């Protein structure tokens, strides 16, 4: 009757600062406030953030990147606020052109400033990656968040580096701007024989529905559970309790099959992982080795 | 047959339709009323799929496509060669996909655990709809439906989106795939999350949900919870799909010349639409 | 061809992928039985997987998964056919007999522990500087069955410490004992509690808990289990 999708009653007590294993405390920050807001649907507490020297670097670089694009697009406005906010999703910060090749000689409006901003993003997002890594090790946790981020990252290196270089030219890299990647994108297929005929392309289509019918499933069949315990996951691992036997009952009586409560974890890190894992091959491969789908797909190979 | 502690949950009761008639299991799938009408609709579409396939002149599964009537035959019927099988393999699929939601319905009550699954389902049930009943009925023709075939289909997707210039610039498909995006990092981070404190270093003892909730603040600054994560997920994937729904029923109805060119309303809002310079004067 | 390796390899890859994840998803519940609890002819395609051990933390020692599984308990069952596959009618009350949708697991006889080995649920009464932050405050409101009936008074809410979480709300019966209600499974309205569940009569019959300001998990299941079953048993 009451369905649990938000909560009827919140609760506050004093700011919880966290689990310290070997965290060093010294980065952290103090607690943020709290929302009300957020409480009807998740935790109400902002707060602490660690930020250490890692942390800092890539804080700093991400807003670089994103000031570079920034005074690009005002500069493509004319300095000027009404047609900067008419045109935000016209203007491009474009890669330089197929003539400079992978040089650094093309001039700041004509691609140096794309490249700018590319380093920037670089080392924005590694650092960011080993973040994911350090966390998890002062912690004394898996390491599963950053190998799974890897695969995003795969797709995104695979896009404005891996493929540019082994393509012999930055020109070909994705550029910064709302409407202008988006050309990009269909550009792309249509250049390449039609990316529906990559199989790496609909292998991704495949994960990326999959994690919508996976985590509708998971999180439909959890909150169905709650009533037991259910999104006490970690101890229904445990000690497995009536939640875990009937969410893996309810899948076995629907499709003849289940899950354990750790293992559709594991289900789910995958089905999301190969999302970008598959894509990322299958533009790695296009143009490099395959120029055209369609033709490749009458002969596969 | 059974798990170690099915035993005890399989009760009597819990049926909509039949009382007992139908309150029973074949192998680890619970049947129910809705068991046998989904059994009956799925054996009819794919006998009337297999007898599409014969008059197609194929078997090959990469080869065997169910084509909607042609738009001629408007909101009518065709014959089956030419219309007719799908409109019934429609009618077949729409029931073995809601007696399925119904069946769900009936395991639950089962089970005494909550509605979500058959809810989330519905939202699936609905965006076919869309594809196959509501869009081509306010177009006025069945032949806007997608064809029943693996490539076919693929073939669809590629011409309706093109009708209307490059697709992407349609906005509520925009929001249908942010959320589409959204909702694989979230399911991302909660796998890796999870296993993470279940799958600690090496020697070191499972971690707490609180360290999973610290994991997250020390890095992003924010924790949804363990409520929280299970709640969005399931609100991220039926956003997807309900925008996925929204993006196309609009789509050939209410706007139907190039989605591109919809921006513009933005563009010529009366107090910007003039100034010089940028890249639109 | 290049991409035609890359795909040949990858789909042997996700079979393997594939079989890993659906042996990792058989720690639980197997090796499968027939209905009378003996072990299955027919176990399946999979093979069990190698054990794991999980170091559970606070002293509570490890749980080894594929492991013998049994339900320390008695099943209050019987069958209702001559073969598989047809259900199996409660000997007694279901409710009390702890099966079907009132069904509960023998799970560990302890409360869950936070980070810290601090018990995960308390009530609020214990649980220093929490209070209600947001949304009707039930405390004091009376507690309402679908026979229309008031079964008691809510006399606190049972929170999670670390989550900062509605768990429970203890309601006080008419003779002054207390039990423990899901909040999962309650309406708060602005001038009472709603349980649809459980008929005003069915609450006494709520298991209860040995220490007043504890809750083991053992309790959690029972006490859930217990309320669930009423959207069948009640009726
Ligand atoms: C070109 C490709 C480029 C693509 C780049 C993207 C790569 C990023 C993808 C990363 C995947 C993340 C998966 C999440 C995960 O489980 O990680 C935990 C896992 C353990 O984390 P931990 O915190 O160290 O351990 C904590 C626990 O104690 C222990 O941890 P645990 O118990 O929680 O998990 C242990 C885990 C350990 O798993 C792994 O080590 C991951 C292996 C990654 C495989 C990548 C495959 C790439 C696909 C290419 C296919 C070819 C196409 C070209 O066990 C498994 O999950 C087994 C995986 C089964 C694979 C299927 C086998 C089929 C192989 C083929 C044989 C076919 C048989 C016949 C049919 O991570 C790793 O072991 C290291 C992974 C990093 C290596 C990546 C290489 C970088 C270059
Ligand atoms: C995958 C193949 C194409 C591609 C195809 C598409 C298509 C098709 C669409 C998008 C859409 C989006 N893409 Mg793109 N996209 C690609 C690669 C990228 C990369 C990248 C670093 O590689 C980024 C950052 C983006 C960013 C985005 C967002 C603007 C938008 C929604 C994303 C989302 O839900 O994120 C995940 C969710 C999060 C919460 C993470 C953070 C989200 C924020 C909003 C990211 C945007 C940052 C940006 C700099 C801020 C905007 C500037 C302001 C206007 C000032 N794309 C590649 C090249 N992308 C959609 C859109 O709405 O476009 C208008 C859309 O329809
Ligand atoms: C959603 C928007 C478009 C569309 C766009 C695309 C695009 C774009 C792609 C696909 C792809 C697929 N689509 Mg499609 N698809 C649509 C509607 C459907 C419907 C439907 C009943 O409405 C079905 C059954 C499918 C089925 C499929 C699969 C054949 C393939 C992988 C999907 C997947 O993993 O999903 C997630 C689900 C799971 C992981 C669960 C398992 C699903 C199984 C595999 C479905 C099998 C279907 C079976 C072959 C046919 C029916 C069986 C009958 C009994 C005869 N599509 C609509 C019209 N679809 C991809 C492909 O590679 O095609 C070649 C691809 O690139
Ligand atoms: C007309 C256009 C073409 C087409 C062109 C392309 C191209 C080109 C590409 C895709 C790609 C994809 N397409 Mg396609 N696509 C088409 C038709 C479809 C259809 C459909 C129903 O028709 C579907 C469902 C898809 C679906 C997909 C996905 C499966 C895949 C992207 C996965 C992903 O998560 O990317 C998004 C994920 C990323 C971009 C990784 C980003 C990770 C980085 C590290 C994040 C950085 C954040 C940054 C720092 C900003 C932070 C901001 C704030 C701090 C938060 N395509 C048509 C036929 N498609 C991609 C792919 O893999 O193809 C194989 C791709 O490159
Ligand atoms: C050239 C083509 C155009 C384009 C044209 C279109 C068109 C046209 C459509 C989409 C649609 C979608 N596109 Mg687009 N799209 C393009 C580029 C993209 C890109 C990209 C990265 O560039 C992305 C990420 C997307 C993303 C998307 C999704 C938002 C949406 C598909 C999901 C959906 O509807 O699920 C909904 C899920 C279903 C319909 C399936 C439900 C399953 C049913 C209920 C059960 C079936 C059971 C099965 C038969 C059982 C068999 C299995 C048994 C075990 C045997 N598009 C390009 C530019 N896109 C579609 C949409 O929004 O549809 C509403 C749509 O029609
Ligand atoms: C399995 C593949 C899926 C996936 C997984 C994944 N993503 C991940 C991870 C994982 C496992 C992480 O661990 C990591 C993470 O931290 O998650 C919380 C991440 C991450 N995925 C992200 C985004 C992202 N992921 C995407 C995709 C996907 N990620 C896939 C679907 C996409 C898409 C679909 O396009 C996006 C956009 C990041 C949020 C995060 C990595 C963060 C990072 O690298 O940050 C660098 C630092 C910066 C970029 C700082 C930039 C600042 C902002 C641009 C501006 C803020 C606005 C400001 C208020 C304005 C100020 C101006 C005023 C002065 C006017
Ligand atoms: C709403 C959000 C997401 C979602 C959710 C969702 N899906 C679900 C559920 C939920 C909550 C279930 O409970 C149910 C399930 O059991 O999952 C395991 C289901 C399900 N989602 C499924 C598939 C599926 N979901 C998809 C999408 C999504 N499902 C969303 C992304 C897709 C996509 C993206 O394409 C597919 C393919 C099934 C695995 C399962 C439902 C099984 C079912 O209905 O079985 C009864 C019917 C049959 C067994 C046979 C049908 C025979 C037909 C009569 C003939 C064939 C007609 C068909 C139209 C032709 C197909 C041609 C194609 C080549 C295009
Ligand atoms: C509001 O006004 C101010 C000025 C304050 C602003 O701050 C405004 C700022 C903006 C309006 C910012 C808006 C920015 C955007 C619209 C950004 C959009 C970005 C995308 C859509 C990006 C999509 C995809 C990008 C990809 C795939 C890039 C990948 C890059 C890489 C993998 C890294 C490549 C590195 C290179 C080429 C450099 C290598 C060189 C070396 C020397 C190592
Ligand atoms: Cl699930
Ligand atoms: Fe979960």
Redesign the pocket.
């Known amino acids: 009757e009451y369905q649990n999708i938000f909560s009827q009653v919140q609760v506050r007590g004093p700011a919880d600062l966290g689990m310290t294993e070997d965290v060093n405390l010294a980065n952290r920050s103090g607690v943020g406030p709290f929302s009300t807001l957020l409480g009807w649907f998740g935790n109400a507490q902002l707060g602490p953030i660690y930020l250490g020297s890692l942390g800092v670097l890539s804080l700093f670089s991400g807003l670089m990147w994103?000031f570079t694009?920034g005074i690009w697009f005002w500069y493509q406005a004319g300095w000027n606020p009404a047609v900067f906010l008419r045109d935000?999703?016209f203007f491009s910060l474009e890669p330089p052109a197929p003539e400079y090749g992978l040089s650094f000689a093309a001039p700041l409006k004509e691609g140096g400033l794309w490249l700018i901003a590319s380093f920037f993003?670089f080392v924005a997002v590694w650092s960011w990656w080993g973040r994911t890594y350090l966390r998890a090790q002062a912690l004394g946790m898996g390491k599963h968040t950053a190998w799974a981020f890897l695969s995003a990252i795969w797709?995104?290196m695979v896009?404005?580096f891996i493929r540019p270089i082994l393509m012999g030219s930055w020109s070909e890299a994705?550029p910064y701007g709302?409407?202008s990647?988006?050309d990009?994108?269909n550009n792309f297929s249509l250049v390449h024989g039609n990316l529906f005929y990559n199989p790496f392309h609909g292998l991704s289509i495949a994960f990326l529905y999959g994690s919508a019918l996976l985590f509708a499933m998971h999180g439909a069949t959890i909150l169905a559970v709650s009533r037991f315990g259910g999104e006490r996951e970690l101890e229904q691992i445990a000690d497995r309790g009536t939640a875990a036997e009937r969410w893996a009952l309810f899948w076995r009586w629907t499709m003849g099959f289940n899950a354990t409560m750790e293992g559709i974890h594991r289900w789910a890190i995958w089905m999301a992982v190969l999302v970008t894992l598959t894509?990322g091959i299958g533009i790695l491969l296009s143009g490099t080795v395959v120029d055209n789908w369609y033709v490749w797909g009458q002969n596969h190979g | 047959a059974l798990l170690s502690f099915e035993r005890k949950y399989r009760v009597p009761g819990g049926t909509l339709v039949g009382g007992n008639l139908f309150d029973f299991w074949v192998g680890p799938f619970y049947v129910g009323f809705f068991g046998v009408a989904t059994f009956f609709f799925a054996a009819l579409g794919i006998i009337l799929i297999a007898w599409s396939a014969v008059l197609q002149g194929t078997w090959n599964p990469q080869l065997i496509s169910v084509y909607p009537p042609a738009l001629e035959y408007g909101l009518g019927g065709a014959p089956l060669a030419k219309g007719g099988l799908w409109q019934i393999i429609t009618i077949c699929a729409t029931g073995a996909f809601v007696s399925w939601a119904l069946r769900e319905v009936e395991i639950c009550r089962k089970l005494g655990i909550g509605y979500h699954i058959p809810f989330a389902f519905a939202f699936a049930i609905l965006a076919y709809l869309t594809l196959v009943l509501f869009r081509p009925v306010m177009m006025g023709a069945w032949g806007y439906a997608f064809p029943y075939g693996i490539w076919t289909h693929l073939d669809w997707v590629s011409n309706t989106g093109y009708t209307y210039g490059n697709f992407?610039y349609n906005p509520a498909?925009?929001?249908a795939?942010?959320?589409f995006?959204?909702n694989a990092?979230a399911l991302a981070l909660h796998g890796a999350l999870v296993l993470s404190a279940a799958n600690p270093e090496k020697g070191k003892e499972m971690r707490t949900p609180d360290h999973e909730d610290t994991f997250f603040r020390d890095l992003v600054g924010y924790s949804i919870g363990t409520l929280g994560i299970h709640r969005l997920g399931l609100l991220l994937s039926l956003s997807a799909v309900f925008f996925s729904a929204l993006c196309m029923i609009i789509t050939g109805t209410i706007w139907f010349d190039q989605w591109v060119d919809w921006w513009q309303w933005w563009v010529k809002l009366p107090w910007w639409a003039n100034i010089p310079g940028g890249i639109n004067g | 061809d290049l991409a035609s390796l890359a795909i040949y390899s990858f789909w042997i890859f996700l079979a393997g992928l594939i079989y890993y994840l659906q042996t990792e998803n058989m720690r639980e519940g197997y090796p499968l039985e027939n209905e009378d609890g003996t072990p299955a002819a027919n176990q399946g395609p999979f093979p069990l997987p190698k054990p794991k051990t999980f170091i559970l933390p606070h002293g509570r020692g490890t749980l080894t998964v594929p492991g013998p599984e049994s339900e320390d308990r008695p099943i209050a069952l019987a069958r209702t056919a001559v073969s598989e596959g047809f259900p199996h009618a409660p000997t007694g009350d279901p409710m009390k007999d702890g099966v079907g949708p009132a069904s509960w697991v023998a799970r560990r006889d302890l409360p869950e522990l936070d980070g810290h080995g601090h018990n995960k649920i308390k009530p609020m009464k214990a649980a220093a500087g929490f209070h209600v932050s947001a949304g009707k405050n039930p405390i004091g409101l009376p507690v309402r069955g679908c026979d229309l009936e008031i079964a008691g008074k809510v006399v606190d809410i049972w929170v999670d410490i670390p989550e900062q979480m509605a768990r429970f709300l203890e309601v006080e019966l008419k003779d002054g004992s207390t039990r423990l209600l899901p909040m999962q499974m309650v309406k708060v309205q602005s001038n009472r509690v709603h349980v649809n569940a459980l008929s005003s009569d069915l609450f006494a019959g709520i298991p209860t808990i040995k220490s007043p300001t504890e809750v083991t998990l053992l309790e959690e299941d029972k006490i859930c289990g217990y309320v669930a079953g009423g959207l069948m048993y009640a009726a």
């Open positions: 994103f694009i935000l999703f993003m797709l995104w896009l404005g994705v709302i409407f990647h988006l990009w994108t894509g | 992407h498909h925009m929001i795939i942010s959320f995006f959204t990092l």
